[PDB]
Paper text:
Furthermore, [name] downregulates replication initiation as part of a multimeric complex with DnaA and DnaN that is associated with the replication factory. [name] is a small protein of 119 residues, with an unusual predicted organization composed of a leucine zipper at its N-terminus and a putative zinc-binding domain at its C-terminus. Solution studies demonstrated that [name] is a tetramer in which the monomeric CTDs are separated from the tetrameric NTDs by a flexible linker resulting in an extended conformation.
We attempted to crystallize [name] and obtained two crystal forms (form I and II, see ‘Materials and Methods’ section for details). The structure obtained with form I crystals was refined to a final resolution of 2.7 Å with good geometry. Two pairs of these tweezers (AB’ and A'B) embrace each other to form the head-to-head tetramer. The tetramer thus comprises a central four-helix bundle flanked by pairs of helical extensions arranged as coiled coils. The heptadic arrangement of L6, L13, L20 and L27 gives rise to a leucine zipper-type interdigitation of side chains projecting from pairs of adjacent chains (A-A’ and B-B’). These pairs of helices, which are splayed in the four helix bundle region, converge at their C-termini where hydrophobic interactions of the side chains of M34, L41, L48, L52 and I59 with the equivalent residues in the partner chain are augmented by hydrogen bonding interactions of the side chains of N38, N45, T55 and most strikingly by reciprocal salt-bridging interactions between the side chains of E44 and R49.
Author numbering:
A (entry chain A), C (entry chain A): 2 to 62
B (entry chain B), D (entry chain B): 1 to 62
The structure:
Amino acid sequence: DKKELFDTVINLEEQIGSLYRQLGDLKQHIGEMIEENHHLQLENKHLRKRLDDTTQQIEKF
Amino acid sequence: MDKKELFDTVINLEEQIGSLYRQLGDLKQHIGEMIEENHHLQLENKHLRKRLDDTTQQIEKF
Amino acid sequence: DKKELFDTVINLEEQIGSLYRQLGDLKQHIGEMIEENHHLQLENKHLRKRLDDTTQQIEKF
Amino acid sequence: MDKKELFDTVINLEEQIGSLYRQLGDLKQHIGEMIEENHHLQLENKHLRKRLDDTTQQIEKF
């Protein structure tokens, strides 16, 4: 009927809004993971440089 | 080593879903329109059959 | 975790597949309504023409 | 009186959703990749801190 079809369409709408919300959450968590990655790369760089410097220091004495 | 490209992909996704919402709305509008059109045609043809019945009853009585 | 995020993404996938299926049903019903419309328009045309012809017939006698 | 235009709109919608599916898949792939990358970096930095600790224990003993 009118109801049976309209409510179907609005049901689709609401499912779409739900998807959007969930994808927003996902975006947030993905962002957090990206920043995590970034910091890990920087930390890795510094620990590498530190190890190189301390290795050269030991190579001296 | 991929970084913000994937993030922009996510944003692109959210934009596409956002779009889908609006399109679904317009679809709903056109659907309702077609439903009204169908109802109008229905009752219209019913009454047309009324008048047709009456006028055929008139002619077939000369 | 790995699970908590991956299962989220696959959950989104499945919701998308669900939406697609539902939209397929909708497409079917919309098609049926369109054909219904078509037939109604044709029937309307013919009943109009019939009424015009029979009206002219009565206008004769 | 609108007809098949709306139908083509529906088809366009189904095509967009179909697309979203694939994009979500690729997204999943890149996500997994970044997760592995994060784990590698984690353990790598842990061991780097091991070696750093040991070598600092070596230097500070002259």
